[PDB]
Amino acid sequence: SGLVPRGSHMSTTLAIVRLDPGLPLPSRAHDGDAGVDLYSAEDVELAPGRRALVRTGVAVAVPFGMVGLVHPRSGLATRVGLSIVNSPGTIDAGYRGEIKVALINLDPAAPIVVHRGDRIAQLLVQRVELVELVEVSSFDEATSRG
Amino acid sequence: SGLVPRGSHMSTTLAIVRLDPGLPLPSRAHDGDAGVDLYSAEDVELAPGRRALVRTGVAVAVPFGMVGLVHPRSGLATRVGLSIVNSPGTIDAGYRGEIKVALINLDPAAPIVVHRGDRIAQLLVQRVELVELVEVSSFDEATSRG
């Protein structure tokens, strides 16, 4: 597998520092999966309605022209009401700090216990358009929907 | 319209199975819209704060190198506080099951009634970078923000 297949020639490298090397490197659960799963570095208990800012133990260098996106996992979302307050979290190209996940318990009654080493979110990487705004007085000067 | 116009030459086909053929195929509400609207196959009532995992009656084959993304509709979000616990839901290229939507009622007091055949979310399809992680000891070895 050190040979990059023709179909993966243009695939993107993401530099990562394991700030907590006791956690595995994030990985795709299955071939073709959009995201790599991020771990919790911490034990945390969330009562109903409470949030926390949870360390993942990693820092990344998203390439210029791209964005990292932190999305909730669907299983925990349905089973226990686990969500992310700022979802999708937006990780900028220039960020060199630790990725942190703003977990929240949206269940009305049952606490959520997160253990160190649990997979608590997924990180996608996508291209983004670094847009140049052009201010106009009206869209004329410059649709079905309107 | 069987002729693919020059400007749509590179547009992507998405194979879909209507597991519930009583529902219309998902469609864009207007030309240029980012997403196709997903239907509920089910009647569901959500008391304030409650969630459900709602069947959409479809399965798709997102192409390798892409991702499907399940987003809430803005009208229901404002009018009645309808949201999605794991938003944006992440549909992987390898998934061949039914798309399910984790609806939640974020209103404090009024129940939300969803009927079979209502449009309850929107599905976008985007390219994703299937990233190769490169572990480094520091970003040096390998920004304004820092």
Added chain:
Amino acid sequence: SGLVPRGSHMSTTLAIVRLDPGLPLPSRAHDGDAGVDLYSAEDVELAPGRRALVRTGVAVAVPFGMVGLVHPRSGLATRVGLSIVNSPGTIDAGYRGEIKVALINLDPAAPIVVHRGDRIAQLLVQRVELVELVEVSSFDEATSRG
């Protein structure tokens, strides 16, 4: 800076109307940032659990083949529990109205005060696949995960 550098040759213009010209044009907080920050045109107070549909004072013309995406800011999300009900908000290419943000207070006890001129969300622009659905009876006729 009127010269487009070789590396920004293909970067995208976004036409914008300041419907409220008392607010600054949205901008990236730092070079390489994925999104430009949207302002509130309004003063709004959100009690715990309450939502509002907040005017941003801008209208944009997202290019055909692209999507605008309204994401929460991470600082307010952690500090005070500020979220967006329909996050990520989906701004279609054909939309020429004012961008509105569906803010919600997910804190259990403390109200959130938003002032006119505060930065309350971020707007990304990305390509989207305008998909052509092909209905199949089974995926055969037309994976690790299954």
